[PDB]
Curated annotation (Swiss-Prot):
It comes from Bifidobacterium longum subsp. longum (strain ATCC 15707 / DSM 20219 / JCM 1217 / NCTC 11818 / E194b). It comes from the Bacteria. Signal peptide: none annotated. Optimum pH is 8.5. Stable at pH 5.0 to 9.5 at 30 degrees Celsius. This is N-acetylhexosamine 1-kinase. One of its GO terms (molecular function) is kinase activity. The gene is nahK. Its EC number is 2.7.1.162. Residues 17-355 form the Protein kinase domain. PANTHER family: AMINOGLYCOSIDE PHOSPHOTRANSFERASE DOMAIN-CONTAINING PROTEIN-RELATED, SLR1880 PROTEIN.
Length: 355
């Protein structure tokens, strides 16, 4: 608190500081709530282990937030250092301040389809108002993040190495990913040849990062912009479907409880396409369902790769944790495959309705 107040003094706060306490349930940044005799603020110590290049990350954040503010859209509002920087290095730490976005609630899992539709609307609105932004200006904060062919090379490397001798125990899981190999390059290929628009991508579309109004329930702002990068909005949509349209937790051991919900798929798509109708392309719309397949397979192969490497990337609570996780992702992709007729119809219906 002595140090915290000291850190706070580096920033152009518009109220005398009266308190500073840890805040929120995030686990990458170290997050504090700053109270003043006036407005409130978010103060964060950035994760420089994961994000060593703070200058480039804050440049990305500044570019996107500025575009939104210029257009009168609510977003993260950086509070500058006394020197006019967007962040400060203090005693071997990287710190930044945002205005506290007031009067919101957020979720840690999808409670129901209405909330999921509103999550869809939030990112559709995010995409819509960045549709004119030159996404290529953004640096790749985590290289190859949703480059599924790259992830598959990582997976194959982990399989070849088989450092723990675990491959013997997951042949069906391995064969699932090997057999789908010709599917991984669909979105990367479209970006490279222009058939799929290069857009801003958020890359952590979990609901924790979507603030909704505390009274109306309506989407308010997208936060947690650390992983903002160029890519396809399909990377974001696909991932939201992966975690959000599942009837189960990511590590559900009972696979009979794991299903791909077309109701939740419809809900997100209604919200998302409803805000992005004027910008979304024919090829994009066509790939909405498959984007769910793609990002789910990417995530699943990463879990299985981690299992084979001795669980070095994802936290685990028991020895087979990553294998259990890879299994839910496999189950979800199989249902998405089997429901392709339905989801295609859902998208087509939603597209025409939005007009
Ligand atoms: N500008 C802000 N206004 C209000 N709440 C915020 C703001 N920034 C972050 N939060 C809250 O702090 C939590 C963690 O912050 P976030 O930037 O998502 O960190 P992490 O990268 O660790 O997830 C969020 O889940 C959100 O509830
Ligand atoms: Mg977050
Ligand atoms: Mg984050």
């Amino acid at each position: 608190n002595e140090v915290l107040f000291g850190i706070a003094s580096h920033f152009a706060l518009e109220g005398a500081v009266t308190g500073i306490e840890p805040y929120g349930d995030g686990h990458i940044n170290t997050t504090y709530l700053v109270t003043t005799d006036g407005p409130r603020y978010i103060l964060q110590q950035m994760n420089t282990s994961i994000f060593p290049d703070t200058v480039n990350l804050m440049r990305n954040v500044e570019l996107v937030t500025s575009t939104l503010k210029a257009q009168g859209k609510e977003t993260l509002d950086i509070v500058p250092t006394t020197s006019g920087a967007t962040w400060a290095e203090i005693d071997g730490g990287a710190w930044r301040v945002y205005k506290f976005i007031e009067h919101t609630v957020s979720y840690n899992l999808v409670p129901n389809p209405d909330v999921f539709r509103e999550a869809g609307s939030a990112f559709g609105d995010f995409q819509n108002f960045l549709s004119e932004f030159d996404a290529s200006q953004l640096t790749e904060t985590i290289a190859h993040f949703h480059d599924t062919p790259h992830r598959f090379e990582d997976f194959k490397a982990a399989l070849a190495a088989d450092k723990l001798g675990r491959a013997a125990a997951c042949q069906p899981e391995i064969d699932f990913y090997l057999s789908h190999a010709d599917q991984y390059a669909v979105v990367m290929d479209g970006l490279r040849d222009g058939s799929i628009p290069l857009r801003v991508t958020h890359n952590d579309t979990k609901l924790n990062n979507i603030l909704m109004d505390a009274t109306t329930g309506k989407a308010r702002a997208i936060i947690d912009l650390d992983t903002i990068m160029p890519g396809s909005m399909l990377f974001d949509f696909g991932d939201s479907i992966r975690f959000g349209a599942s009837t189960a937790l990511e590590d559900e051991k009972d696979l009979s409880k794991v299903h791909f919900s077309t109701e939740l798929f419809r809900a997100y798509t209604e919200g998302f396409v409803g805000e992005l109708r004027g910008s979304i392309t024919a090829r994009e719309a066509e790939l909405l369902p498959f984007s769910g397949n793609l990002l789910t397979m990417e995530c699943g192969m990463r879990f299985l790769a981690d299992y084979l490497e001795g669980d070095i990337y994802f936290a685990t609570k028991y020895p087979e944790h990553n294998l259990v996780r890879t299994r839910t992702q496999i189950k979800l992709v199989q249902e998405m495959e089997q429901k392709a007729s339905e989801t295609r119809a859902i998208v087509a219906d939603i597209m025409e309705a939005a007009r």
